[PDB]
Tab-separated table of N, CA, C and O in Angstrom:
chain	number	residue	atom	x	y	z
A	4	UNK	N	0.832	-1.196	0.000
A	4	UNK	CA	0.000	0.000	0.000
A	4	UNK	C	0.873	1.255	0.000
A	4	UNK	O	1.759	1.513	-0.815
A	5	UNK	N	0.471	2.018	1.077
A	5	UNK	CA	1.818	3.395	1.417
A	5	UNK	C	2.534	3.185	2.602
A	5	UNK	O	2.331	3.640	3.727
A	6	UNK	N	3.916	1.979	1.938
A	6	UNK	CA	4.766	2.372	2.857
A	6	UNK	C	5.883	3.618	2.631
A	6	UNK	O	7.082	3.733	2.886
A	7	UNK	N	5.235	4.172	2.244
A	7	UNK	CA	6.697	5.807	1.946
A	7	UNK	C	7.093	5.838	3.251
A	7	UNK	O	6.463	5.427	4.226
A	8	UNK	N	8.649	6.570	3.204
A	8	UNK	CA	8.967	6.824	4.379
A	8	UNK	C	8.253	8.047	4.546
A	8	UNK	O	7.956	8.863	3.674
A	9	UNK	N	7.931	8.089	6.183
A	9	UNK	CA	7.860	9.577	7.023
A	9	UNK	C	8.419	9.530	8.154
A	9	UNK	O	7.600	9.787	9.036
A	10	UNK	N	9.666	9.272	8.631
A	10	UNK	CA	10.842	9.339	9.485
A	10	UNK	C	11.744	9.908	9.072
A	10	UNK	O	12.183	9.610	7.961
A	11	UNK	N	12.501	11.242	10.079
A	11	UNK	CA	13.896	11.924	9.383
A	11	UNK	C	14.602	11.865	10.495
A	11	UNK	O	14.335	12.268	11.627
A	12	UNK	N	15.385	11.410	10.136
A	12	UNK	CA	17.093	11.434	10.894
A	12	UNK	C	17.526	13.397	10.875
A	12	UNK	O	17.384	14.139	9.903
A	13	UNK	N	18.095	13.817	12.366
A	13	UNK	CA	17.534	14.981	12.145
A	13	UNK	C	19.075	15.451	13.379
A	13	UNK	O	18.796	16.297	14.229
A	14	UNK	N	20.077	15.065	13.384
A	14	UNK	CA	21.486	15.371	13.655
A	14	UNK	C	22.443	16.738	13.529
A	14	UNK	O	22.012	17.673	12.854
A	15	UNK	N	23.785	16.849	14.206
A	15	UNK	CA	24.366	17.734	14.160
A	15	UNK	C	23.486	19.699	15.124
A	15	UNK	O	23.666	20.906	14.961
A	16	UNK	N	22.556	18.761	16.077
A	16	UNK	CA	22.204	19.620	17.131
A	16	UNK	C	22.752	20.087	18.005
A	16	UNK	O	23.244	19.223	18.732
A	17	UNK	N	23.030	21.651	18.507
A	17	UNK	CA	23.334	22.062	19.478
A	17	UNK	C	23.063	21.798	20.864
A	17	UNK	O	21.864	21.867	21.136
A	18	UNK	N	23.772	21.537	21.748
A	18	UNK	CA	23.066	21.124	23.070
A	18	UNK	C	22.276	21.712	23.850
A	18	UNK	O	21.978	21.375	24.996
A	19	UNK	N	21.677	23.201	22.861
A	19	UNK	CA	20.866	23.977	23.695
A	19	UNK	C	19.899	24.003	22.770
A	19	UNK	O	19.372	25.104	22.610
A	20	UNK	N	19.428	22.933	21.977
A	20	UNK	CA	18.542	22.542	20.905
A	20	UNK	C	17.814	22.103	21.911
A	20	UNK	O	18.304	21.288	22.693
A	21	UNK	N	16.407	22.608	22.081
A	21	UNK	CA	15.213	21.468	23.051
A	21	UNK	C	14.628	20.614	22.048
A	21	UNK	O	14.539	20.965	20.871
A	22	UNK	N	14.206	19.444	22.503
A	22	UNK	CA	13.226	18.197	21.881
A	22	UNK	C	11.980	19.238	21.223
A	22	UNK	O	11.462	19.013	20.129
A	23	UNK	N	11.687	20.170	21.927
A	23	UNK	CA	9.750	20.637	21.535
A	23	UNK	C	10.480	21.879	20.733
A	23	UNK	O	9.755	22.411	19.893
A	24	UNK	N	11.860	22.438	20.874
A	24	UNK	CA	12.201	23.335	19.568
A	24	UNK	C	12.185	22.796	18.064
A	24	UNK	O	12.131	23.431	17.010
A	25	UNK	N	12.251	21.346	18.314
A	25	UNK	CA	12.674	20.858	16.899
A	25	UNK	C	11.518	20.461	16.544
A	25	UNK	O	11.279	20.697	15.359
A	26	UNK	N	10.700	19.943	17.115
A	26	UNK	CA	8.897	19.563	16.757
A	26	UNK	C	8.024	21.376	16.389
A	26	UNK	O	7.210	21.726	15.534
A	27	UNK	N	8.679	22.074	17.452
A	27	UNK	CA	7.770	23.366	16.362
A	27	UNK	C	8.670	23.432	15.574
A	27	UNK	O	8.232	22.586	14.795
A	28	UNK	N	9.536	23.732	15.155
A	28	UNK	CA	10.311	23.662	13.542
A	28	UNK	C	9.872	23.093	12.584
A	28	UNK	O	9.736	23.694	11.519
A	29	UNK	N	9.524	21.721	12.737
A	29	UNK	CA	9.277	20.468	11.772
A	29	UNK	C	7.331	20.871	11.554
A	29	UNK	O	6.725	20.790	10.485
A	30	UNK	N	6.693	21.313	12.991
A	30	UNK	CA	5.136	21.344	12.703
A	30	UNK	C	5.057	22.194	12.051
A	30	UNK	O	3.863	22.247	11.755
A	31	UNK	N	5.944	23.555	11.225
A	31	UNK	CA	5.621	24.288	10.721
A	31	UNK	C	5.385	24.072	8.773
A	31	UNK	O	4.839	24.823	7.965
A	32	UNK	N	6.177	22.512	8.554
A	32	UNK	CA	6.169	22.156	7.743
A	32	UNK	C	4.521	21.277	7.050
A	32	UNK	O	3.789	21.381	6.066
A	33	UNK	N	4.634	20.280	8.546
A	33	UNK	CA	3.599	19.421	8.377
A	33	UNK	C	3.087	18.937	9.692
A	33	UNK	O	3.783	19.057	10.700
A	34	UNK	N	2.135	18.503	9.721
A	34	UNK	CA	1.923	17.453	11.443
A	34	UNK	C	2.630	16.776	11.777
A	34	UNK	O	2.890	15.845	11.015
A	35	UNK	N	3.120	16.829	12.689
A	35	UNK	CA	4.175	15.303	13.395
A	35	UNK	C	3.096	14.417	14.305
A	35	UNK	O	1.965	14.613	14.748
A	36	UNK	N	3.913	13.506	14.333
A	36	UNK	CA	3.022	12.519	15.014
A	36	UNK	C	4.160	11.849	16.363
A	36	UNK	O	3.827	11.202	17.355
A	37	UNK	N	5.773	12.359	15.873
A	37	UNK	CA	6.063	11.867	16.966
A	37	UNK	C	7.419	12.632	16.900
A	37	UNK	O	7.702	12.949	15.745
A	38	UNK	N	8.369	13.027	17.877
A	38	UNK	CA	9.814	13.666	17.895
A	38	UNK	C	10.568	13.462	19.057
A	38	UNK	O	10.545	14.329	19.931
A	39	UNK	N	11.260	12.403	19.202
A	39	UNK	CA	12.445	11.679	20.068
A	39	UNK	C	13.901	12.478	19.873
A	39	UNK	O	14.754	12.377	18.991
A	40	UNK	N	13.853	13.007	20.629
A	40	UNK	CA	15.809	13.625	20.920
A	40	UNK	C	16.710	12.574	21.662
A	40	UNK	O	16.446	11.859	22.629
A	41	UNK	N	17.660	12.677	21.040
A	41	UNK	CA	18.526	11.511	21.999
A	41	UNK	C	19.779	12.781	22.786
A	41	UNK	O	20.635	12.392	23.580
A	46	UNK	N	26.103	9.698	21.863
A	46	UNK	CA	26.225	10.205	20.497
A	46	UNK	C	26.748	12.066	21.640
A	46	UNK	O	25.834	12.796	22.023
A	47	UNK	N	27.768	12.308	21.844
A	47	UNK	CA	28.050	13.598	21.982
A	47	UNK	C	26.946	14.578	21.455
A	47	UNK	O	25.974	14.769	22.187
A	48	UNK	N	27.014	15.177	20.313
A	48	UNK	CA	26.198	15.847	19.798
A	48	UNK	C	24.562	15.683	19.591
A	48	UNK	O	24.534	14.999	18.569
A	49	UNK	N	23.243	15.904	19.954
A	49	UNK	CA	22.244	15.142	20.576
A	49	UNK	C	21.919	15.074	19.228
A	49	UNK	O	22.510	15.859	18.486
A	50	UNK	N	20.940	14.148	18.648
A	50	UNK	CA	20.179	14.034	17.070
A	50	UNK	C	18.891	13.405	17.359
A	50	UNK	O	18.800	12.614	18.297
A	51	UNK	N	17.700	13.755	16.483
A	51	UNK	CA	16.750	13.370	16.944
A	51	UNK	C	15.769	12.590	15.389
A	51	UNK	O	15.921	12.740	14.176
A	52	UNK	N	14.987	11.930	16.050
A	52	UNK	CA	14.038	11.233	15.079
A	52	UNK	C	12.802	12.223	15.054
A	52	UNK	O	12.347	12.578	16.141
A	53	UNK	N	12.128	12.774	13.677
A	53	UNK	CA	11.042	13.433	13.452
A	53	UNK	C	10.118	11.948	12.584
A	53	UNK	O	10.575	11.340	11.616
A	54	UNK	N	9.006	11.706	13.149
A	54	UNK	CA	7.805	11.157	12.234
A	54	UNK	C	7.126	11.727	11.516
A	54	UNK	O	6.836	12.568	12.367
A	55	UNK	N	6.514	12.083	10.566
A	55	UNK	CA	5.163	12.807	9.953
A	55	UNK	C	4.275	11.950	9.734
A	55	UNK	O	4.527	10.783	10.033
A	56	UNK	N	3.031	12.282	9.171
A	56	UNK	CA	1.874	11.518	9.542
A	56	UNK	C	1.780	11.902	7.998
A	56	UNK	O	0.591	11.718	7.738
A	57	UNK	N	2.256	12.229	7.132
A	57	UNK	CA	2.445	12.464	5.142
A	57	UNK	C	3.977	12.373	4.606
A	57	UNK	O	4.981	12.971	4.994
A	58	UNK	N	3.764	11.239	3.392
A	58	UNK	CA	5.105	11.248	3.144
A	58	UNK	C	5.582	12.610	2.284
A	58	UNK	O	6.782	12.874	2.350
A	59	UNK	N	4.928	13.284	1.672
A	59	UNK	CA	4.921	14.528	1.368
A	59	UNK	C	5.601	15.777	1.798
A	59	UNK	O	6.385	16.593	1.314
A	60	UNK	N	4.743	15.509	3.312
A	60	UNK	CA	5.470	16.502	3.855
A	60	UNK	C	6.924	16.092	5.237
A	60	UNK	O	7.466	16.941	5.945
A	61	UNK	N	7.226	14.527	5.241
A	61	UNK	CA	8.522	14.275	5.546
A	61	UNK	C	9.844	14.837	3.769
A	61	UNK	O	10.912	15.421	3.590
A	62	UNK	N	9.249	14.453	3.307
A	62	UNK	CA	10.051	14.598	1.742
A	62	UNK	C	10.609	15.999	1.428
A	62	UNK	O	11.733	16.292	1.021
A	63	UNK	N	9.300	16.994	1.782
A	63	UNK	CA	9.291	18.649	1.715
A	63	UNK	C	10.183	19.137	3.189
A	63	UNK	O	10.987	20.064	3.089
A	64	UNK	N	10.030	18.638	4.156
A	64	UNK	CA	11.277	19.029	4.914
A	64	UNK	C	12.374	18.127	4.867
A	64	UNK	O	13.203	18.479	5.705
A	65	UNK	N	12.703	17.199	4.297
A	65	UNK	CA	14.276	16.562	3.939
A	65	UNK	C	15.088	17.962	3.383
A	65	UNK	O	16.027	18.604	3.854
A	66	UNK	N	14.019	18.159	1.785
A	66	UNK	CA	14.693	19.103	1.132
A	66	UNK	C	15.140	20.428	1.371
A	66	UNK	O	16.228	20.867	0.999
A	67	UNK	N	14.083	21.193	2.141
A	67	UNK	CA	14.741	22.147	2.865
A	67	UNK	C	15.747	22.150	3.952
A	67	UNK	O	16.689	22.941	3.998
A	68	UNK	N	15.541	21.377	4.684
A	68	UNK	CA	15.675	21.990	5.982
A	68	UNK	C	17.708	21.714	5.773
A	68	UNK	O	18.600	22.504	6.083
A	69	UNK	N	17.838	20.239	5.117
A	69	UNK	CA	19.529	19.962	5.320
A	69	UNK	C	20.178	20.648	4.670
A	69	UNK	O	20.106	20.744	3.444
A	70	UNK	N	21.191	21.452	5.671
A	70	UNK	CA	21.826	21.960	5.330
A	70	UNK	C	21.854	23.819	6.253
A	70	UNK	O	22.759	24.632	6.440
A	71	UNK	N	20.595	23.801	6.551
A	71	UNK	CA	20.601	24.873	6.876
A	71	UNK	C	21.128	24.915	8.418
A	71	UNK	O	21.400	23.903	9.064
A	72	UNK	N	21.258	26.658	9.049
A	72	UNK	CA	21.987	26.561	10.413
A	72	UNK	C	20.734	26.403	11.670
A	72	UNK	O	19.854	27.222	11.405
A	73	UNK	N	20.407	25.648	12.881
A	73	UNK	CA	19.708	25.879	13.653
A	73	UNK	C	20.398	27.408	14.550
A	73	UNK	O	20.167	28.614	14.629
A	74	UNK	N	20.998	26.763	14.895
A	74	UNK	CA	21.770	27.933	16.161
A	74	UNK	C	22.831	28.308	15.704
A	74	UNK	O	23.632	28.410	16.633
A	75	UNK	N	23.430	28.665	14.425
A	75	UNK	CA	24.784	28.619	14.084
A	75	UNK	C	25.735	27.492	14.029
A	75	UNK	O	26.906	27.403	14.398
A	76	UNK	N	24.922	26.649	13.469
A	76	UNK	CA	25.068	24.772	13.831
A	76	UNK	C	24.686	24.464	12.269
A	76	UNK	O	23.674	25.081	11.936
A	77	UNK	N	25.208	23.721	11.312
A	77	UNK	CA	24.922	22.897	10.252
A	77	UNK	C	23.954	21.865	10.603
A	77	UNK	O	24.432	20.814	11.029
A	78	UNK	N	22.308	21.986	10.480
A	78	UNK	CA	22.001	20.477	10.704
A	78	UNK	C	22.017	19.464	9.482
A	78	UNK	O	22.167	19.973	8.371
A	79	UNK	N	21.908	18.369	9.549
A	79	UNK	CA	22.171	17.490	9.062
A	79	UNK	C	20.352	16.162	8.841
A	79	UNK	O	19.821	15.270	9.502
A	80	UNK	N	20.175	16.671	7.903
A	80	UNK	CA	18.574	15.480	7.722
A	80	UNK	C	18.301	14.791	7.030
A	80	UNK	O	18.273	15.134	5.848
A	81	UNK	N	18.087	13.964	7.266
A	81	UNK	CA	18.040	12.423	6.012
A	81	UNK	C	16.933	11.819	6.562
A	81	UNK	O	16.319	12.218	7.552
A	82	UNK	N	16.577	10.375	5.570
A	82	UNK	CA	16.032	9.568	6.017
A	82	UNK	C	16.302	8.767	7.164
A	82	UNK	O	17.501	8.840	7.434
A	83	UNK	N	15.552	7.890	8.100
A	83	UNK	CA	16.298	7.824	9.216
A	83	UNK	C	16.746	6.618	9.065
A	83	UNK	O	17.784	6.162	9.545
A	84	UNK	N	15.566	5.796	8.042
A	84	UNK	CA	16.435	4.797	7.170
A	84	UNK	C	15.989	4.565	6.100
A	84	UNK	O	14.888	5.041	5.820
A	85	UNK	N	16.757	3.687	5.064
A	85	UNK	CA	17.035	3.718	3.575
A	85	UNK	C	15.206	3.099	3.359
A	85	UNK	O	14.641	2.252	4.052
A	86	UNK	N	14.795	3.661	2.498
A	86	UNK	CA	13.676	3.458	1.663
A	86	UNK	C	13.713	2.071	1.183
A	86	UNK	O	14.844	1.734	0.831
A	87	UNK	N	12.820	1.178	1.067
A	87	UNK	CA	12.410	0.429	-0.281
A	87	UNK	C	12.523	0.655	-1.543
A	87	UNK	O	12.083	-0.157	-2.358
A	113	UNK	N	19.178	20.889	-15.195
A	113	UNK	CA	19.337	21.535	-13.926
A	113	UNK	C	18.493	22.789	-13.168
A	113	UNK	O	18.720	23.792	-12.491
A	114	UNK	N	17.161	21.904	-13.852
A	114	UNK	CA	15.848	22.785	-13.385
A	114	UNK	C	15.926	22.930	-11.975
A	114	UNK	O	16.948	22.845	-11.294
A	115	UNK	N	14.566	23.195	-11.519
A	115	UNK	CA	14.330	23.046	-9.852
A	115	UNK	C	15.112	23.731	-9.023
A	115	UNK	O	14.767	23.802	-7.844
A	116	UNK	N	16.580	24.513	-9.557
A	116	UNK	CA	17.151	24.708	-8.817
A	116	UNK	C	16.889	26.066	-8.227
A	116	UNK	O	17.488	26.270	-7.172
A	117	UNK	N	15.986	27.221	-8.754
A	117	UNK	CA	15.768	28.099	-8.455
A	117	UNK	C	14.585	28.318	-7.274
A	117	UNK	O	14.469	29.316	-6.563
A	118	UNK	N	13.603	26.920	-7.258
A	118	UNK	CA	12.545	26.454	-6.585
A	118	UNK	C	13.406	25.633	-5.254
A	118	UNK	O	12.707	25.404	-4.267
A	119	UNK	N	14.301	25.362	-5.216
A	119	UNK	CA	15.286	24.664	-4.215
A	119	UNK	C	16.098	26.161	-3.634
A	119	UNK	O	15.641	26.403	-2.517
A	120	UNK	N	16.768	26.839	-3.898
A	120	UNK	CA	16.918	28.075	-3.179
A	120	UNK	C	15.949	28.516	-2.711
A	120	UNK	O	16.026	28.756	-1.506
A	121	UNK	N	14.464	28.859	-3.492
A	121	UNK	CA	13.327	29.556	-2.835
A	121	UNK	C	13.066	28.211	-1.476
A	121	UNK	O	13.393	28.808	-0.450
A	122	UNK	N	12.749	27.117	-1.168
A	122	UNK	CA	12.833	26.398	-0.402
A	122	UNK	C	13.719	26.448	0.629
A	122	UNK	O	13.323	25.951	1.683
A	123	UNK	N	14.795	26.909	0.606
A	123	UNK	CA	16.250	26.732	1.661
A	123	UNK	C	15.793	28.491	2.247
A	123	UNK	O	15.739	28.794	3.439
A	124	UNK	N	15.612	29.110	1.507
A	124	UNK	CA	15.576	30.494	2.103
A	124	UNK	C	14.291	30.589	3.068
A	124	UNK	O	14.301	31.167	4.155
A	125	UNK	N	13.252	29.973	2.537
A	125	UNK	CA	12.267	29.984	3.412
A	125	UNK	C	12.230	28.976	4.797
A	125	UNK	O	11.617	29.209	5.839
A	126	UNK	N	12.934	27.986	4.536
A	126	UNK	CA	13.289	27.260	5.578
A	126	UNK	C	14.257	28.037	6.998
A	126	UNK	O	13.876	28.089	8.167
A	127	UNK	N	15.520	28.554	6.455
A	127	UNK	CA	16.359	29.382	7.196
A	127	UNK	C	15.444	30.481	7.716
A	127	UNK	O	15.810	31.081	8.726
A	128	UNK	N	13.949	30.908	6.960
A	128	UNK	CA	13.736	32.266	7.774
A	128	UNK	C	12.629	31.653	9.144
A	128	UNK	O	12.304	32.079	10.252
A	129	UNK	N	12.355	30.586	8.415
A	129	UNK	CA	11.085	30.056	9.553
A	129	UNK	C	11.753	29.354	11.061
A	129	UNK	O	11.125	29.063	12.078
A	130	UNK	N	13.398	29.192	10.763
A	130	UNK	CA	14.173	28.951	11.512
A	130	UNK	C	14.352	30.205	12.767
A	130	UNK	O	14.347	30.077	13.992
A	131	UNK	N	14.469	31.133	12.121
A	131	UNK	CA	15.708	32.975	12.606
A	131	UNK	C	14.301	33.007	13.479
A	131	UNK	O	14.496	33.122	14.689
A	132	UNK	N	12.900	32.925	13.062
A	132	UNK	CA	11.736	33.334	13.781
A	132	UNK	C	11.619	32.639	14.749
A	132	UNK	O	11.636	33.188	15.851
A	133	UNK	N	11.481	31.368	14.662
A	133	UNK	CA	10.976	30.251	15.806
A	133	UNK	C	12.331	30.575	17.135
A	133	UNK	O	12.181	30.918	18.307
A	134	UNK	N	13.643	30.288	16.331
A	134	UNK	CA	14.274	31.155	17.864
A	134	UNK	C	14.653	32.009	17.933
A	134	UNK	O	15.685	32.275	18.550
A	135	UNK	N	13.805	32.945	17.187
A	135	UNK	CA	13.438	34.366	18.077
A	135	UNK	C	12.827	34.354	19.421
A	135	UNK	O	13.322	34.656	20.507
A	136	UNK	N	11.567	33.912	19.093
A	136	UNK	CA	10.578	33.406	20.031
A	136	UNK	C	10.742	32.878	21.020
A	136	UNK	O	10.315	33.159	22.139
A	137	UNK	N	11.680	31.684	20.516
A	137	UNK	CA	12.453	30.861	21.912
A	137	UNK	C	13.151	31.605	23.020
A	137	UNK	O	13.186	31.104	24.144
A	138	UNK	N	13.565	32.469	22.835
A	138	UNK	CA	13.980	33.536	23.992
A	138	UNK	C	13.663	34.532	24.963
A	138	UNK	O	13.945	34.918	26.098
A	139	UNK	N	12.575	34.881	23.471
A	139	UNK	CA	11.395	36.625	23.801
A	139	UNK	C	10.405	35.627	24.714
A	139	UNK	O	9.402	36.085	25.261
Protein backbone atom coordinates (compact mmCIF):
# COMPACT_ATOMS: atom_id res chain seq x y z
CA UNK A 1 0.00 0.00 0.00
CA UNK A 2 1.82 3.39 1.42
CA UNK A 3 4.77 2.37 2.86
CA UNK A 4 6.70 5.81 1.95
CA UNK A 5 8.97 6.82 4.38
CA UNK A 6 7.86 9.58 7.02
CA UNK A 7 10.84 9.34 9.48
CA UNK A 8 13.90 11.92 9.38
CA UNK A 9 17.09 11.43 10.89
CA UNK A 10 17.53 14.98 12.14
CA UNK A 11 21.49 15.37 13.65
CA UNK A 12 24.37 17.73 14.16
CA UNK A 13 22.20 19.62 17.13
CA UNK A 14 23.33 22.06 19.48
CA UNK A 15 23.07 21.12 23.07
CA UNK A 16 20.87 23.98 23.70
CA UNK A 17 18.54 22.54 20.91
CA UNK A 18 15.21 21.47 23.05
CA UNK A 19 13.23 18.20 21.88
CA UNK A 20 9.75 20.64 21.53
CA UNK A 21 12.20 23.34 19.57
CA UNK A 22 12.67 20.86 16.90
CA UNK A 23 8.90 19.56 16.76
CA UNK A 24 7.77 23.37 16.36
CA UNK A 25 10.31 23.66 13.54
CA UNK A 26 9.28 20.47 11.77
CA UNK A 27 5.14 21.34 12.70
CA UNK A 28 5.62 24.29 10.72
CA UNK A 29 6.17 22.16 7.74
CA UNK A 30 3.60 19.42 8.38
CA UNK A 31 1.92 17.45 11.44
CA UNK A 32 4.18 15.30 13.39
CA UNK A 33 3.02 12.52 15.01
CA UNK A 34 6.06 11.87 16.97
CA UNK A 35 9.81 13.67 17.90
CA UNK A 36 12.44 11.68 20.07
CA UNK A 37 15.81 13.63 20.92
CA UNK A 38 18.53 11.51 22.00
CA UNK A 39 26.23 10.21 20.50
CA UNK A 40 28.05 13.60 21.98
CA UNK A 41 26.20 15.85 19.80
CA UNK A 42 22.24 15.14 20.58
CA UNK A 43 20.18 14.03 17.07
CA UNK A 44 16.75 13.37 16.94
CA UNK A 45 14.04 11.23 15.08
CA UNK A 46 11.04 13.43 13.45
CA UNK A 47 7.80 11.16 12.23
CA UNK A 48 5.16 12.81 9.95
CA UNK A 49 1.87 11.52 9.54
CA UNK A 50 2.44 12.46 5.14
CA UNK A 51 5.10 11.25 3.14
CA UNK A 52 4.92 14.53 1.37
CA UNK A 53 5.47 16.50 3.85
CA UNK A 54 8.52 14.28 5.55
CA UNK A 55 10.05 14.60 1.74
CA UNK A 56 9.29 18.65 1.72
CA UNK A 57 11.28 19.03 4.91
CA UNK A 58 14.28 16.56 3.94
CA UNK A 59 14.69 19.10 1.13
CA UNK A 60 14.74 22.15 2.87
CA UNK A 61 15.67 21.99 5.98
CA UNK A 62 19.53 19.96 5.32
CA UNK A 63 21.83 21.96 5.33
CA UNK A 64 20.60 24.87 6.88
CA UNK A 65 21.99 26.56 10.41
CA UNK A 66 19.71 25.88 13.65
CA UNK A 67 21.77 27.93 16.16
CA UNK A 68 24.78 28.62 14.08
CA UNK A 69 25.07 24.77 13.83
CA UNK A 70 24.92 22.90 10.25
CA UNK A 71 22.00 20.48 10.70
CA UNK A 72 22.17 17.49 9.06
CA UNK A 73 18.57 15.48 7.72
CA UNK A 74 18.04 12.42 6.01
CA UNK A 75 16.03 9.57 6.02
CA UNK A 76 16.30 7.82 9.22
CA UNK A 77 16.43 4.80 7.17
CA UNK A 78 17.04 3.72 3.57
CA UNK A 79 13.68 3.46 1.66
CA UNK A 80 12.41 0.43 -0.28
CA UNK A 81 19.34 21.54 -13.93
CA UNK A 82 15.85 22.78 -13.39
CA UNK A 83 14.33 23.05 -9.85
CA UNK A 84 17.15 24.71 -8.82
CA UNK A 85 15.77 28.10 -8.45
CA UNK A 86 12.54 26.45 -6.59
CA UNK A 87 15.29 24.66 -4.21
CA UNK A 88 16.92 28.07 -3.18
CA UNK A 89 13.33 29.56 -2.83
CA UNK A 90 12.83 26.40 -0.40
CA UNK A 91 16.25 26.73 1.66
CA UNK A 92 15.58 30.49 2.10
CA UNK A 93 12.27 29.98 3.41
CA UNK A 94 13.29 27.26 5.58
CA UNK A 95 16.36 29.38 7.20
CA UNK A 96 13.74 32.27 7.77
CA UNK A 97 11.09 30.06 9.55
CA UNK A 98 14.17 28.95 11.51
CA UNK A 99 15.71 32.97 12.61
CA UNK A 100 11.74 33.33 13.78
CA UNK A 101 10.98 30.25 15.81
CA UNK A 102 14.27 31.15 17.86
CA UNK A 103 13.44 34.37 18.08
CA UNK A 104 10.58 33.41 20.03
CA UNK A 105 12.45 30.86 21.91
CA UNK A 106 13.98 33.54 23.99
CA UNK A 107 11.40 36.63 23.80
Amino acid sequence: EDEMPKTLYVGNLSRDVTEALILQLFSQIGPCKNCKMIGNDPYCFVEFHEHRHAAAALAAMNGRKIMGKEVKVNWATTPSNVKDYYQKWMEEQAQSLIDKTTAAFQQ
